Amino acid sequence: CCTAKEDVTTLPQIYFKNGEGYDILVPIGNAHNLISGTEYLWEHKYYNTFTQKLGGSNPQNCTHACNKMRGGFKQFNCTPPQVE
RNA sequence: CUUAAAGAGUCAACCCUUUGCUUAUCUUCCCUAUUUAAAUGUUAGCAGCCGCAUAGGCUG
Numbered sequence: 001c002c003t004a005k006e007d008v009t010t011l012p013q014i015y016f017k018n019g020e021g022y023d024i025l026v027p028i029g030n031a032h033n034l035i036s037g038t039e040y041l042w043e044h045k046y047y048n049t050f051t052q053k054l055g056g057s058n059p060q061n062c063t064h065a066c067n068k069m070r071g072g073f074k075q076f077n078c079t080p081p082q083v084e
Numbered sequence: 085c086u087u088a089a090a091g092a093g094u095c096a097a098c099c100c101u102u103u104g105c106u107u108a109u110c111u112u113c114c115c116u117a118u119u120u121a122a123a124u125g126u127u128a129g130c131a132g133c134c135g136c137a138u139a140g141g142c143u144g
Contacts, residue, residue, distance in 0.1 A: 012087035027087045 035065055038074045050075040 008026050016025045041049055051072040053059065059066040065073075 012089085014088055015085050022085075024085095025087095029087090 031063075031065065034073050035069070037076075038069065041074050048077050050077050 011026050011028065013024060013026050015022045017023070040046075052075050053070065053072040055062040055066045059070050
């Protein structure tokens with residue numbers, strides 16, 4: 001079941017240095033991080049955070065986690081302090 | 085060589101109705117203000133006639 005698939009379409013593509021050259025790099029999301037972050041920051045009540053529902057109004061499209069956890073995946077609120 | 089690359093959130097709203105804050109009272113008792121000197125810079129730069137002069141002189 002666990003194999004590979006490659007579609008850089010719609011996928012951010014950034015350069016990152018290899019030390020003496022560059023390496024064009026595609027950042028994709030982590031599945032363990034998303035579901036584990038939702039469960040843990042809900043069960044230890046972390047509230048300086050966001051909520052994002054992946055898929056839109058039909059969350060059966062993206063993944064199976066999307067389809068089940070339709071309440072919304074939780075993202076960290078990475079807002080810095082503001083002066084004055 | 086930036087999760088780079090890119091995108092209209094628009095829309096509408098009756099908050100509102102009523103009310104008892106009341107009552108009460110010892111601020112009082114005492115006090116060393118004190119002492120001492122130059123109005124000076126000279127002081128007031130004035131009162132009038134001699135003249136066209138608000139130019140220049142005289143008079144005390």
